[PDB]
């Protein structure tokens, strides 16, 4: 028979943090159990605030609140919402209503990439396209981003609500939704179907944040030499640039610029790179 279950140091993930308690999901036993914990019974001197998404060691006894013992090193941390250890971001945009913008997509991609997160791309409202030229343009963009190496899912509004092709990605990951406010929120609600503080919702074998990420798109923490790494296409071509640390702006014998000339890198990707570079540089005085 089962006895003394509570005399070990189990591990779990913080899925909710509210009013002085931390709710820890523990999948490591036949049970799916959520344990209400205080952060205080050990974990100091160590003033670090626990965050939703933290991987923790905790202790808990029968019919008593638990206590966080140790917070594991964080792989990443978002500021708004305050969450950490995020594996993936589903970036949701509309094909029409409003018209799809590679500029907007590329900005979100940079932010996700710069936070050590894997982007997944979702273009919805495909059902609202009547013009064949509009359909062809969106299919071409989708193939472009697939060729860069992203997963790209084209969905109808009242259909994508099912999230059929996205759901498989949730398993054993922590995921956030971001992108356009309208479609991003509606897709997210669809995902987690059966200010407030963010929670992770346990669904389809993984965790999904109940608040959109990346609500502000400033590049404040990104430096000029770091930007190219967030464009996998530019990043890979940068190996062939003559000068080391080439920023792919006015340098001669730049492989990135040559690739754009040849059609090996999309013109719009490079155009956005240069635009974002300018924005980064404009933070500071120039000499």
Whether 51 and 16 have beta carbons less than 8 Å apart is answered as no
Task: State which H helix or E strand residue 7 sits in.
Answer: none
Q: Which stretch binds ligand IUM (CB under 6 A): 115-123, 175-183, 213-221, 273-281?
A: 115-123
Decide: is 151 part of the binding site for ligand IUM (CB under 6 A): no
Q: 172: which DSSP letter?
A: T
Q: Which of 29, 61, 65, 116 binds ligand IUM (CB under 6 A)?
A: 116
Decide: is 246 part of the binding site for Zn ion (CB under 5 A): yes
Please tell me the total number of residues recorded for the chain in this structure: 287
Report whether 53 belongs to an annotated binding site: no
If you search the block for the tokens 């028979």, which residue do you land on?
1
Q: Tell me which of Zn ion, Ca ion, ligand IUM, none is bound by residue 118, counting a contact when its beta carbon lies within the kind-specific cut-off of 5 to 8 angstroms.
A: ligand IUM
Question: Number of residues in contact with Ca ion, rule: CB under 5 A?
Answer: 2
Could you please report the per-residue DSSP string of 40-74?
A: -SS--S--PPP-BT-EEEEE--TTS-EEEEEEPPP
Q: Which stretch binds ligand IUM (CB under 6 A): 65-73, 114-122, 137-145, 273-281?
A: 114-122
Whether 83 and 176 have beta carbons less than 8 Å apart is answered as yes
φ, ψ (nearest 5 deg) of residue 78: -95, 150
Q: Which of 118, 157, 190, 203 binds ligand IUM (CB under 6 A)?
A: 118
Quick one: 207 or 234, whose CB is closer to ligand IUM? Answer: 234
The contact set with Zn ion (CB under 5 A) reads 241, 246, 248, 254, 256
The contact set with ligand IUM (CB under 6 A) reads 113, 116, 118-119, 232
């Amino acid at each position: 028979a089962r006895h003394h279950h509570h005399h070990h140091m189990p591990e779990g993930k913080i899925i909710k943090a509210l009013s002085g308690f931390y709710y820890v999901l523990d999948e490591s036993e036949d049970s799916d159990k959520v344990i209400q914990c205080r952060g205080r019974g050990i974990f100091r001197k160590n003033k670090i605030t626990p965050l939703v998404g933290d991987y923790v060691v905790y202790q808990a006894e029968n019919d008593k609140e638990g206590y966080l013992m140790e917070i594991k090193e964080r792989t990443n941390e978002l500021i708004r919402p305050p969450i950490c250890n995020v594996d993936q971001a589903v970036l949701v945009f509309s094909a029409v209503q409003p018209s799809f913008s590679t500029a907007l997509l590329d900005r979100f991609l940079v932010l996700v990439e710069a936070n050590d997160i894997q982007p997944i791309i979702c273009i919805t409202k495909m059902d609202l396209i009547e013009d064949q030229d509009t359909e062809d343009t969106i299919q071409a963009y989708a193939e472009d981003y697939r060729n860069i190496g992203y997963d790209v899912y084209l969905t109808s509004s009242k259909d994508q609500d099912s999230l059929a092709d996205i759901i498989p990605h949730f398993q054993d990951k922590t995921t956030v939704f971001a992108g356009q406010s309208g479609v991003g929120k509606s897709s997210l609600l669809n995902a987690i179907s059966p200010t407030r503080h963010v929670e992770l919702i346990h669904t389809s074998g993984g965790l999904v944040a109940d608040t959109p990420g990346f609500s502000s798109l400033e590049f404040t923490d990104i430096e000029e030499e770091e930007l190219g790494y967030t464009f996998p296409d530019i990043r890979e071509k940068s190996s062939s640039c003559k000068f080391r640390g080439c920023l792919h702006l006015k340098e001669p014998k730049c492989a990135v610029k040559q690739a754009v000339e040849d059609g090996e890198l999309k013109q719009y990707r490079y155009d956005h790179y240069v635009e974002f570079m300018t924005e980064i540089k404009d933070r500071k005085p120039r000499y």
